Amino acid sequence: AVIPHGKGGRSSVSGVVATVFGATGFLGRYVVNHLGRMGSQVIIPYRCDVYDIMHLRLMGDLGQLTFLEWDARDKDSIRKAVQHSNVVINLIGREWETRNFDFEDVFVNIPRAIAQASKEAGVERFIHVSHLNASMKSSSKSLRSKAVGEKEVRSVFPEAIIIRPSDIFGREDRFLNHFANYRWFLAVPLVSLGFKTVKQPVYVADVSKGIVNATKDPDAVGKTFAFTGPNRYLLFHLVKYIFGMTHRTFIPYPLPLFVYSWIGKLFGLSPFEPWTTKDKVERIHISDVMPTDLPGLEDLGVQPTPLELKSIEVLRRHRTYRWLSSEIEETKPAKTVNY
Amino acid sequence: QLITVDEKLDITTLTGVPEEHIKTRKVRIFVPARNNMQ
Amino acid sequence: ASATRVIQKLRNWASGQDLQAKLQLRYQEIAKRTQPPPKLPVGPSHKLSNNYYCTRDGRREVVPPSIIMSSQEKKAVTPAPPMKRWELSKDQPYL
Amino acid sequence: GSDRSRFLEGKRAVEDKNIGPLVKTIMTRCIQCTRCIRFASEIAGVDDLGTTGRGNDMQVGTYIEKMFMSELSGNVIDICPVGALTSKPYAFTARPWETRKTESIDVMDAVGSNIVVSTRTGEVMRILPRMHEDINEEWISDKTR
Amino acid sequence: ITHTGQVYDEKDYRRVRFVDRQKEVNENFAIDLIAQQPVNEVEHRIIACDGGGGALGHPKVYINLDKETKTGTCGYCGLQFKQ
Amino acid sequence: TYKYVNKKEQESEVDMKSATDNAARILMWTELIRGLGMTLSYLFREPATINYPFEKGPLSPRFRGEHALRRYPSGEERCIACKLCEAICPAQAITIEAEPRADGSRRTTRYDIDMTKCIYCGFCQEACPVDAIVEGPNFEFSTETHEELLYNKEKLLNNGDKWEAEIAANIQADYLYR
Amino acid sequence: VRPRSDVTHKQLSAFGEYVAEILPKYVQQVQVSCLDELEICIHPDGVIPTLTFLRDHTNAQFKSLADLTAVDVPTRQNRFEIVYNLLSLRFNSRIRVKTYADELTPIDSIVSVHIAANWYEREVWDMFGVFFFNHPDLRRILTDYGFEGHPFRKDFPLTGYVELRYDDEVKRVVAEPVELAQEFRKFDLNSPWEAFPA
Amino acid sequence: RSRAEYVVTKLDDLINWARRSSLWPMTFGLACCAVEMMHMAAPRYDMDRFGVVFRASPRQADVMIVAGTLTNKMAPALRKVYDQMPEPRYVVSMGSCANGGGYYHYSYSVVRGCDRIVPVDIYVPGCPPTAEALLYGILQLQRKIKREQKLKIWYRR
Amino acid sequence: TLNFGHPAAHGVLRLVLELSGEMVRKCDPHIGLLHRGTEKLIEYKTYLQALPYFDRLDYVSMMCNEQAYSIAVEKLLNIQPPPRAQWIRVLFGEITRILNHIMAVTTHALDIGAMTPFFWMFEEREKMFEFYERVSGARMHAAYIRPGGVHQDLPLGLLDDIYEFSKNFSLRIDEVEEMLTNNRIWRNRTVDIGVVTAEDALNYGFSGVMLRGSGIQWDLRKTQPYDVYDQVEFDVPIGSRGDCYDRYLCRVEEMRQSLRIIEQCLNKMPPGEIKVDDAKVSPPKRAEMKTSMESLIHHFKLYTEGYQVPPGATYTAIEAPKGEFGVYLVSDGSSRPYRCKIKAPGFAHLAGLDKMSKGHMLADVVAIIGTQDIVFGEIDR
């Protein structure tokens, strides 16, 4: 262990040495931020070239962030990453099944091997992240596969926390940017005209802070928290609201999903990071599940942050010079649906 | 003409010190002793 | 250097100056390295006699400022003699 | 004093002594100032340390090698202005300009002797006495230093 | 490992620093290298170790080799001399 | 002694010849052509640049460059932890903590020069009595990561061993001067 | 030992008396250092009057303001010691007029007497906190736009209380209380032995 | 040779060569290290020879050389200029004032390093880091740019 | 309100301007972007370990800057440097004014748009730094001029090499002389721009080439001769009218006059010691500290503690290439200073930009900053 000395800011010590395999991610970026702010020792396994992880260097202090070359297929790389970590956090995930990695791999196969080694190593705790409402029978292969994982990893690593976040709201997120980027599309398809798929977003930071707090709290063991949010929404208001802040016309036109799953298949064929995914589509119209579960935010210590509050920052880049100065007050809020 | 104030010059509000280090910091006024070495 | 005469002549002319006489690049004119070993001179105060420091320590023989007009007919006096006008140069007065 | 030297002749050297396990006597440093022989007789009643010989090889060390074992022993360190005999535990751990000096109280014994704890970068390096006329007048025990 | 037995414990995490990198240490350790040099058998009670090279060495000091049992060691070089 | 620059001593009254000469100066840009001649002239001069990797700009013995800790010929590191190199460092760069080695000798357990803090003044070179810390000739030690720039005793001692031959030659050349 | 000419220590001394006589309402002390430098000391109210006499007097023309500074002696009731160093290109001599100002007792501004002071007075406010009445535009010059505290005051920590880093979460530079990775080692340097009577 | 792997190794080698050969740098110009580079731009150690642009606006700059102390009043700007540079972009921190605080580390107005403000690729050491020393640092950036394998990572991703 | 600020200007100047069309009606320069705390750090540092700071205030005239601190500290210690050292400081002081002027004239042109003058002279500048490096070991930021005397003797080949540089340097000034002194384009860009009247220059505390350019005859090198400036002969290049041209022409003349002073220094440099022989003020020689006890004690105390200069305060001004550089050093009896106000020729000059750049275009302001030779290290300190 490492006795925590310091005042609490950078150049201080908190005693959390933590491997974080998928740090380069949108959620990840945030996880390393708090861990680094707190003063924790963060080992970031990376596969993308060094150029892309530079954004993580200034976070954390000198000799507090260590980057290791790692390959998912190669078991040895995971082995050495967790050699000297006592906390392992797994954020490995993707939306597009890539040529050389299947949803199973990114969600269930890999995240197993990882926790498996972590145990061999003797890491005190492992935090595994799987998408919210993930039935072993859910339509989207992604969600189901993720469900498959949360089970397995429990056998490789017992009492391994399993936070299960909803789609995340944050700058650089998809949930909010995706819809806002429908601008290019003249019309914005919305299955069931964006109805009956009530959704509860959660700010990225809230999720991050929550995750971090897990690392430094004994109360969470085998817990399957669910960071959800401060307000639910029918996809209709969300879509329009977005377009509202973006100040771009909103033209909700219903599109039969059966045909739309096909549109997802189309972009899905794209070689360079398909923008929409068959598995995405389903997910988007996959209704958010209700909140009866080990609570996440608040329960883990952070009060959720309403979407409207920070939406202005996430959607600003999509506006035009004409609306750039416009502020949240000028715009209207969307409506929640306790349903 | 001069004005009258019985208020102990407190200028804590102008010095520009963070609140924590003005209310939790005790300073000792002492004449330094001599290291016995010299 | 090492320039064919014609280039030099063009150079000198286009520039309007005998640039060859004063080339910027240095060639075997610069002090050779490993110049001989130096035996530097020891200054005063190294005498072994009549060298008492008390007689050579201006550091603290200095005294506290002299005080005039402390709070605790006569002719006018200037800060100092009025300055003397500078004189135009003689090698090159103008330009 | 002066800025230079005129002693072009050779120097002297005096064999060191293992006076004890607390005081390191690198006595080639000694300026034969006899404050040790006094303290060791007047403040403490040891009456062991003494001058031996005459001339420029008067060495102020125990004639036979008998350790200076007494409480009040470590004070010799503080009282020898030269660094001939100094403390063996605090041999070379620090150098005084660096040491931050905090004035505190002796808790090892009930005389409550005043002392100064010299700390560098956050670990105590030395505890030496600070003067209290009534309680410890410039001296501290072998235990509390 | 290092000159001073600086070896991160089997559980310390600064060992992560050495992961995929060389922990810089020097094979040539002084404690040993001085030992190799033999004791100089001078024939005068007090000899001086200028440090070798005069001005290019260490401050000049005189050592008393009078103690028959032990050998004088320059506080600077560590070189030892015996009478 | 003063000198007027740009002060016209007197009013030369225009003479046709003078006027023509001037008018020609404005009309046919005569002085502008003068300037072009100067640059054409250098175009013909040998360029002063050096192939940087193949040729190196000359540095004489006192060049301060990169810190190194020297060792005696025998193999005993020169530093005896007097710690005044720490005292005179202007930037607070050198951190030294010491304890008596098993041999009984004085030596530094930790000697850390923070090169990013160091401003390469060269006073440490000056201050050392045994001259254990020296300003080594190498100036090329640019590093990918900030941590590499912080240097402990082992890097400096290793730096000392690598460059000892040239450091010895450099100190040999300049010690009479000091 | 430096060469000292007493011609100056006499000339300057006399001038000191001359100034004092001409401006007795404000001159408190007038001394000449052993370094041949005069240093009329004036009551803070005499800032405008004493300077103006020196800027515009035939027998003492002190046209340019070399510098305006404020030493801070915390012990002194009037903390700051505003010092104005002036030069006389006509008589090739410099004089220093120094006043005393406490933290909340402002000094007059001399931007009128010398416009050079427009900037230095802003510099003294930013670093030490003395305020100058009738200043055209007094506002921080050297410190950051949001800086809190006057830095050159002897009671201000060197490292200060705030430092800046870029935070990704908020994608913007952000102050945080200073956390230093090697505190300034505070070597004690004063020797316990004095040098001379001085 | 014939393998989709070989074609993707050779083509980045091409992409890396282009970025390596033409690094248009942008010098903020803080403190004095800017002079020790104005000497690199100058004739004894030309930088253009290597494919380095003496003066480049942020939007057309590949490399930012931070020379000089980054005070707490210029920090908010450096980040802006770094943020407004085109994506392929690299930072070289010159001077003990910039890579670490150097003299002025403990000042209340100096950021202790530009690494706190902008991610730094090569740290060039020295109070006035010599001009060859900067040239070695720029050449070290070119060695780092040669090693990068962006196309290979996309192929096996 | 256009907030100009890399600003084409020297250093970093956020010149908050107000563009009445292209004509600029007001400038509010926001300096402070390079304030390092140089004068609050010096209070915590001994007199020798604060010398280095003075090489970084104006970073283009290093040694002349460290001749102002060296003269101050020396005054407060009533000690004077040995004769050879004073000539060496005057030799290095004029190499620095040639170095600053090559900086000021060529970078001004870089701003206006002439690019070649910078390259030709900058090669002549590395020739010069070499002289710094060969005498101190640092190309710039030497630390050679010490509070008492200078640090080490000149290497045995430097004065021959300084002659060879000075012998051929004047042709190099002559060459930019032809390329940038009569070009109608330069004259038009520089002549009648930023005229400053004589009394206004004294009132704004300009004190430099800006003072001399408008015809006021003031050089601290002849008026108040510091070091040996009483035994060297030179002509101050007083300009007549004050336009940015007359100020350029003055800067080109001072480079020429400095070659006249450098010539005299090489011709008449005395045999002797380079640092005062009081071990109390200047460190003891390497051989002496390693053989004599009085010298080791003096070396140990001087490096670890300090000179302990006697209590007092002094304002010492020397003619730095930019203008009058002065240090007001207040000293308690302690080895570390109490206050060190660096008067920067430049804090006064930048204040004048608003008055000098009156009724002028956006382009004129680029020339106005260029003709003040402002380096923000000195202004920001």
Ligand SMILES: NC(=O)C1=CN([C@@H]2O[C@H](COP(=O)(O)OP(=O)(O)OC[C@H]3O[C@@H](n4cnc5c(N)ncnc54)[C@H](OP(=O)(O)O)[C@@H]3O)[C@@H](O)[C@H]2O)C=CC1
């Ligand atoms: N809206 C959301 O973001 C939500 C996310 N989650 C879960 O949170 C986790 C983090 O999400 P997010 O950050 O958006 O995901 P990202 O798409 O940002 O990727 C996360 C990280 O996983 C790494 N990664 C992906 N595939 C592989 C692979 N085959 N081998 C090695 N590394 C890989 C990536 O590294 P690289 O880019 O270098 O390949 C990346 O750094 C995910 O696992 C997801 O299941 C759950 C609910 C909502």
Ligand code: SF4
């Ligand atoms: S006190 Fe120290 S110095 Fe004086 S005699 Fe005893 S030992 Fe020698």
Ligand code: SF4
């Ligand atoms: S000065 Fe030389 S010897 Fe003394 S500690 Fe510093 S380095 Fe080691």
Ligand code: SF4
């Ligand atoms: S590093 Fe040395 S040189 Fe570069 S800026 Fe800071 S001080 Fe000036």
Ligand SMILES: [Zn+2]
């Ligand atoms: Zn020895």
